[PDB]
Amino acid sequence: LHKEPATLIKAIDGDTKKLMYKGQPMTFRLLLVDTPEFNEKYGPEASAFTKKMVENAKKIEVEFDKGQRTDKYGRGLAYAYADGKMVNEALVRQGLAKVAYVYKGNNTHEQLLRKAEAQAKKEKLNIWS
Ligand SMILES: Cc1cn([C@H]2C[C@H](OP(=O)(O)O)[C@@H](COP(=O)(O)O)O2)c(=O)[nH]c1=O
Numbered sequence: 001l002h003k004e005p006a007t008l009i010k011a012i013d014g015d016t017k018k019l020m021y022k023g024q025p026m027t028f029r030l031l032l033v034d035t036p037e038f039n040e041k042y043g044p045e046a047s048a049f050t051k052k053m054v055e056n057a058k059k060i061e062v063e064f065d066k067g068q069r070t071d072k073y074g075r076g077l078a079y080a081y082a083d084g085k086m087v088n089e090a091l092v093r094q095g096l097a098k099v100a101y102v103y104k105g106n107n108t109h110e111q112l113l114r115k116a117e118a119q120a121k122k123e124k125l126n127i128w129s
């Protein structure tokens with residue numbers, strides 16, 4: 001897998017954001033995770049966490065997996081990095097997302113993220129509290 005450039009256009013919520021990618025605006029949905037909706041418990045906190053992570057970053061990159069690069073809604077499906085740190089993993093490690101939506105062929109980082117979930121759950125963090 002390969003990291004590619006993108007720039008932040010706007011934070012949206014815990015697991016979606018609007019990024020400019022190859023010079024075109026796109027909504028990106030984070031692979032392999034599910035944050036609570038803004039309306040739900042921890043929803044606000046997930047949204048804030050992702051917003052802070054991406055807005056503070058000097059360099060945003062997206063990394064596509066081996067499988068489908070856009071979902072049925074036209075959202076990009078990617079792992080997103082903020083100054084080298086994966087947003088997907090960071091949300092899970094903080095208990096602000098669950099590992100979810102693990103589809104065959106877009107699951108390169110599955111085990112990495114499950115390891116982070118186990119640690120967040122062991123620490124009883126946020127969703128796991
Ligand atoms: C994360 C992800 C979501 N999706 C689709 C599945 C769900 O379809 P449905 O809308 O029919 O429930 C939806 C969940 O995304 P959200 O969690 O952003 O709502 O996005 C994919 O198809 N591939 C993916 O990798």
Ligand SMILES: [Ca+2]
Nearest residue numbers: 015034035036
């Ligand atoms: Ca969600």
